[PDB]
């Protein structure tokens, strides 16, 4: 969940190491930061069951 929107992975799954959330491919553990370039948005944060709160990184803002 981010800013009231539901973000889903383009590929792979979301996993937590106990303190931080990452997105990784299913057949081999190789975690990366969750960003707008590896997720897609569909529906709001209220429609998905089991949805959790986090921040999704936007790679374009640091240069603006």
């Amino acid at each position: 969940c981010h800013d009231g929107k539901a973000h889903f992975p383009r590929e792979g799954v979301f996993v937590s190491n106990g303190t931080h959330w990452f997105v990784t491919q299913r057949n081999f553990y190789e975690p990366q930061i969750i960003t707008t370039d590896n997720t897609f948005v569909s529906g709001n944060c209220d429609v998905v069951i089991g949805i959790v709160n986090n921040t999704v990184y936007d790679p374009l803002q640091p240069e603006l």
Binding site: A6, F8, V13, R26, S42, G43, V47, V48, I49, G50
Partner: protein, 49 residues
């Protein structure tokens, strides 16, 4: 399906379905938004066997 090609790997059932929906060309968000509808249709289909 993982236990059929190696060690068994636990997964939430709703996520197992999400993979199976992607496998037929239907974006996984369809499952989550309609999880209750899908579970209900399943329950009915099994009951009629």
């Amino acid at each position: 399906w993982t236990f059929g090609a190696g060690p068994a790997l636990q997964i939430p059932f709703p996520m197992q379905m999400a993979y199976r929906f992607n496998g037929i060309g239907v974006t996984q968000n369809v499952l989550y938004e309609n999880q209750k509808l899908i579970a209900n249709q399943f329950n009915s289909a099994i009951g009629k066997i």
